[PDB]
């Protein structure tokens, strides 16, 4: 074991279990990205950087050239993978302890070998490469945008691009003020399913609704090299 890590996100309030063959290092909250001074910076979901031991709507501060730092006084953001918790009927911002049920949990685990994701770009599960075994299957998550159309994405070779639960709204937006909410411009981008005959043909536009979303999203598998 040369020090390989695998990060998993439950997308629920419950800690996820480490996949077969790996050992738990720690559990935390699923950080998707932050936005400071209007610049988004993400933490790849397949890396430990997306799993923070402590949650905060404003987990960072900034410092200037006069050697003065400011904490939460401005208008910065933090974004976290969320749970199935329904968005409040009032649709008003969520604060304090009421935020907890909306934040996804994660586990960082030590693995005996390298891990990677493969995507089928079809409704079927792509097989793990020659010599690699399955850790989990999911849906191909590519990138996202939210406030100011800023955002970040996942490395398609990383387990972070393979979420186990498809969610039309996989993340929640939080502000330094201490509020969090789901906003209409919170966009999640997923790889689409493509038939062999559609590759070199004009894509056929489609607008999908509740009940027919998940079936048009590329599937993926997270695999670990056998040793």
């Amino acid at each position: 074991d040369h020090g390989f890590l695998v990060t998993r996100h439950s997308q629920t309030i419950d800690d996820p279990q480490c996949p077969s063959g790996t050992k738990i290092l720690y559990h935390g909250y699923s950080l998707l990205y932050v936005q400071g001074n209007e610049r988004a910076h993400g933490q790849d979901l397949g890396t430990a950087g997306s799993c923070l031991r402590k949650f905060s709507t404003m987990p960072f501060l900034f410092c200037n050239i006069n050697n003065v730092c400011n904490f939460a006084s401005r208008n910065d953001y933090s974004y976290w993978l969320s749970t199935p918790e329904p968005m409040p009927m009032s649709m008003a911002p969520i604060t304090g302890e009421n935020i907890r049920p909306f934040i996804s949990r994660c586990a960082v685990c030590e693995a005996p070998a390298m891990v990677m994701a493969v995507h089928s770009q079809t409704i079927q599960i792509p097989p793990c490469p020659s010599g690699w075994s399955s850790l989990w299957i999911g849906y191909s998550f590519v990138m996202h945008t939210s406030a100011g159309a800023e955002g970040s994405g996942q490395a398609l070779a990383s387990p972070g691009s393979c979420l186990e639960e498809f969610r039309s709204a996989p993340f929640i937006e939080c502000h330094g003020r201490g509020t969090c909410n789901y906003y209409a411009n919170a966009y999640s981008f997923w790889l689409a399913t493509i038939e062999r005959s559609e590759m070199f043909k004009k894509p056929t536009p489609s607008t999908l609704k509740a009940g027919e979303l998940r079936t048009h999203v590329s599937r993926c598998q997270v695999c670990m090299r056998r040793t």
């Binding site: 074991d1 923070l52 402590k54 905060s56 960072f60 200037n64 904490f71």
Partner: protein
């Protein structure tokens, strides 16, 4: 063949840890800005250690088969030394003392960074040893809304020396570098709560009252 990258934050190239063969030393590259679009190098990866410095280390081309080197308005950003900030831009040889140096070391195992989000130093996981302790460096911004950030599991997010302005801006064509007022460094905060913080209480921290509010980290390497 894991590559351990170290940035000295001084004008002296760092020494590789015992047992690790040095592949090369260079200058701490943070990011390039071409067409006002930042492209960063992860400080924990070897690409952030460029053997040869230049205020303009890149060129660009378009489909018309024309390439321009130092013929427009691009920039380069480098990790800074802990040297006192100059009052005016520095040129050519006067730049040297401001550019952090780095070394790329061939390591036997992978190195990771862990963050406490607390004043306490976070433990390296069981079976891993500490290579160094530092402060949780998260991201940065400078000209416009351009900038970048570090991966928190990368050693690049753990700087041994906290610096409010940890990097410098070099004007590609003028061959000068300087620290401008719009430069910002972002760091993980220390959170008093055990794991879930309530509405954050806004605050302004001045010299001497800062470091106690910056998350700490350790860079760890798997013991074989």
């Amino acid at each position: 063949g894991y590559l351990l990258v170290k940035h000295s934050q001084t004008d002296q190239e760092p020494m590789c840890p015992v047992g690790m063969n040095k592949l090369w030393s260079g200058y701490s590259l943070l990011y390039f800005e071409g067409q006002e679009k930042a492209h960063n190098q992860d400080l924990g990866l070897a690409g952030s250690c460029l053997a040869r410095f230049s205020t303009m280390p890149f060129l660009y081309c378009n489909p018309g088969d024309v390439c321009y080197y130092a013929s427009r308005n691009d920039k380069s950003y480098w990790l800074s030394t802990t040297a006192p900030l100059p009052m005016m831009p520095v040129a050519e040889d006067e730049i040297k003392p401001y550019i952090s140096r780095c070394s790329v070391c061939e390591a036997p195992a992978i190195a990771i960074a862990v963050h406490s989000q607390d004043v306490s130093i976070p433990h390296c996981p069981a079976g891993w040893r500490s290579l160094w302790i530092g402060y949780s460096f998260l991201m940065h911004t400078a000209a416009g809304d351009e900038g970048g950030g570090q991966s928190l599991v990368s050693p690049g997010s753990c700087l041994e020396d906290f610096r409010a302005t940890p990097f410098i801006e070099c004007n590609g064509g003028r061959g000068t570098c300087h620290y401008y007022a719009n430069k910002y460094s972002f760091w993980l905060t220390t959170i008093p709560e055990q794991s879930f913080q309530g509405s954050p209480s806004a605050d302004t921290l001045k010299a001497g009252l800062i470091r106690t509010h910056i998350s700490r980290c350790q860079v760890c390497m798997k013991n074989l």
